[PDB]
Ligand SMILES: [Mg+2]
């Protein structure tokens with residue numbers, strides 16, 4: 001339940017993803033750079049923030 | 057980039073050998089609870105928590121940092137696999 | 150649900166210029182006219 | 198920031214001493230970046246009027262509005278009396294601080310473009 | 311340079327011009343912009359936060375006998391300017407009872423002690439004959455923009471949270487002129503222009519903005535190392 | 536409201552320092568950073584060379600026989616000279632330098648003056664050869680900011696060459712605002728202020744003066760008309 | 761003028777009033793995540 005989630009869960013989630021990376025993939029994956037590994041940074045919102053330099 | 061990644065790549069003949077060593081070292085640290093680390097207390101990776109600084113729980117970060125020190129010996133056919141495990145169990149229960 | 154504009158929502162004009170909102174700035178951060186009127190939307194001239 | 202300004206106000210006037218070339222500039226006859234010839238050499242008023250001891254002074258003058266990033270001036274960088282805009286000097290410092298090596302970064306960039 | 315002369319020109323409780331001259335070259339932007347940013351962001355005010363309408367369960371409903379739906383009524387309420395005459399007052403509830411046919415304005419709220427409505431001619435709803443509008447409007451005091459999803463203030467079960475824009479300052483513009491004193495012509499003439507909804511006079515908003523900037527500058531006093 | 540931010544300082548020597556203020560309300564990193572940067576680069580009092588006289592030199596673009604450095608390079612070296620007045624009453628001084636080849640002229644070769652300290656005595660002025668004369672008279676004034684030689688135009692005697700006066704001890708200011716969080720507040724700002732100075736004033740001292748200058752100007756919004 | 765610095769943009773900016781539409785594609789209706797959940801009948805792979 002969304003209303004049952006306390007504020008300490010988000011602090012724990014920051015500890016969980018520490019050091020870890022995630023894979024961002026955009027289709028079509030024409031070449032191998034279509035999948036790249038990024039260190040996730042927790043943000044408020046619902047959209048993935050992409051670095052400008054990896055857009056090409 | 058990962059810290060010292062250029063130095064890490066220059067220590068192996070193939071970049072994929074670097075990943076194997078880091079991943080195998082990370083599992084060794086996880087299996088024995090980071091008690092087999094070659095890192096001195098001033099060198100242990102730390103994470104910033106609300107309460108305070110604590111040991112970094114990411115073993116891959118530890119494995120990469122340990123390997124830069126040069127205290128890890130890696131290669132093929134170093135020790136028997138069963139002999140390596142039983143010896144590491146005794147030293148680090 | 151009454152949905153307000155948020156980061157990631159897609160905007161467009163009648164001339165084919167489309168894009169998602171990437172940043173919502175406070176009124177004091179937007180560029181403003183000499184009379185003190187801030188702008189509402191900032192578009193990249195490189196899309197023209 | 199790395200593109201320089203070109204002026205057409207003077208654009209060709211020849212003089213005898215640098216002071217004559219500067220003297221025309223305060224009269225409004227020649228612009229700052231207009232290509233002129235002082236005695237025999239081809240220069241501009243900006244390279245004579247503004248000579249900076251280091252990039253810090255050059256970018257301090259930019260902050261005060263004395264010169265623009267696109268105005269060609271004379272700057273003393275790494276022991277060499279350069280004749281470039283503060284923006285090009287600024288770009289050189291951008292690379293030098295990013296790579297944390299002033300000498301190597303100087304060898305990596307094309308300053309005059 | 312001697313102390314600048316401070317000149318104040320006010321047109322009622324909504325507009326004011328504040329002139330500070332002579333200033334050194336470049337101090338017009340140095341002083342004007344921080345005040346403008348503080349005025350437009352960090353000036354406390356009062357805004358409508360929650361509304362309850364009898365026989366209305368949510369904001370996506372229509373009231374019989376009322377031309378406007380609850381969404382439009384709430385939009386009209388968001389433009390209501392309420393001034394608290396008591397500095398210690400933090401929250402007030404405004405009671406509105408109206409029966410059609412009438413155009414219920416902001417002046418139809420029942421009077422409350424130490425509370426003044428600065429725009430009595432604001433139009434809220436248009437009641438048709440046989441239509442009734444019994445509603446309680448909660449006005450809180452705060453700073454900034456608080457969406458209804460954040461505060462979620464409900465005085466009772468059927469109260470409707472309203473996005474609250476507490477900032478009284480409507481618009482700030484500052485002007486830098488080329489004043490001269492003696493033999494130096496590089497001096498600055500700073501003119502601050504403040505537009506407000508009337509609950510807080512522009513002079514009050516300027517005084518609060520100066521204090522906030524002054525209070526923040528005291529944070530540079532104890533150098534932890 | 537938000538808690539008072541913590542002010543941390545990280546100074547290396549007397550020429551560079553990093554100052555961090557956090558947590559700050561959203562947009563207050565820019566609100567506090569830009570005004571301090573403007574005051575630091577244009578208002579911190581300092582001293583600079585404003586005029587130089589060299590014997591046998593007619594103009595700035597000439598060259599002295601018997602010395603490697605031309606007049607322009609000697610002038611450029613003087614602009615790098617850092618001198619601190621030890622007496623507040625002192626306003627302007629002239630420094631005398633007589634050197635004989637083939638020595639290398641340094642900033643320590645200036646004749647000592649009462650309550651006048653050369654911060655960098657190892658500064659290279661000129662390089663002389665056998666049979667070379669360097670008779671130089673530099674005038675040091677007190678001021679703020681950057682003033683071009685053509686603007687102030689200060690000449691002590693005939694054939695004196697005015698020099699651009701880098702009055703401001705602050706060489707460079709670079710401030711950075713970083714997003715930070717304190718619990719459920721995610722819009723908070725962290726301000727990092729980095730100041731480079733010539734060494735005459737500590738970067739902490741320069742920041743303290745800049746804050747005081749900003750604080751003093753806020754007191755000007757006090758007496759209307 | 762710039763709302764952050766107070767200084768003007770070094771060149772005049774094309775400022776005007778333009779009609780912008782908010783399109784039906786919103787990030788609220790498109791964000792999706794999954795750790796474990798339903799699986800297919802035959803292949804036993806996750807659904808889509
Ligand atoms: Mg000059």
Ligand SMILES: [Mg+2]
Nearest residue numbers: 356357390475
């Ligand atoms: Mg309001």
